[PDB]
Amino acid sequence: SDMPVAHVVANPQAEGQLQWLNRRANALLANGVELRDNQLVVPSEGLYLIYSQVLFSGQGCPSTHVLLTHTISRIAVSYQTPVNLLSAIRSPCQANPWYEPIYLGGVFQLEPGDRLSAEINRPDYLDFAESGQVYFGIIAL
C-alpha cells in the first residue's frame, strides 16, 4: 500500500546502546516515513498506530533495586518538547537469569514533521540474542 509505515529493529551489534535499523528482512520504512537521528519522522497528518517492545535480561540482581523504563515520546510541531505518549516501568529485582518484556502501543494523531523517539533508561540491559525482541514501529490508518 501507500500508507506511511515503519517497523525498525534494534541493531544486534550495537551493544550497550539501542540503535534502530530499517534495512533488514521483515523491517519497514516506507511511503515518506524517515529515520533521522534515531527517531521516526512523520510524513503527513493523520491517525497513527504507534507501538514498541523492548526486552531486558540479566545474570543476577545487583546490590540495588533495578528499575527498567521504556517510553515512546513525541515532539509535535505544535509543541516542541518530548511529550510522553506511551510509558511503562518494570522491576526484575527485589545468580539466576531474568527477562523483562515491555510493550507500548496506542493510536495517535501526528502532524507532518513530528518526530517519534523510543527510548529506555538502561541500554546496558537490552537483549539482542534473537530477532523480533526489540522493535519500534508506526502505521498511518
Among 1, 36, 81, 141, binds other proteins (CB under 8 A): 81
Total number of residues that touch other proteins (CB under 8 A): 35
CA distance 140 to 133: 23
Burial of residue 40 (CB within 10 Å: 0-12, 13-18, 19+) is buried
Contact 58, 92 (CB under 8 A): yes
Among 83, 88, 103, 106, binds other proteins (CB under 8 A): 83
Among 88, 103, 112, 124, binds other proteins (CB under 8 A): 112
Q: Which residues bind a second copy (CB under 8 A)?
A: 1, 3, 5-7, 25-26, 28, 46-47, 49, 51, 53, 55, 57, 61, 64-65, 67, 71-72, 74, 79, 83-94, 96-109, 127, 130-133, 135, 137, 139, 141
Query: Is residue 130 involved in binding other proteins (CB under 8 A)?
Result: yes
Q: At residue 109, what is the residue type?
A: Q
For the chain, the maximum distance between any two Cα atoms, rounded to a whole number of angstroms, is 51
Q: Which of 45, 49, 41 has its CA nearest to residue 116?
A: 41
CA distance 116 to 138: 9
Residues that bind other proteins (CB under 8 A): 9, 11-13, 15, 21, 23-25, 27, 45, 59, 64-65, 67, 69, 76-84, 89, 97, 109, 111-112, 121, 128-131
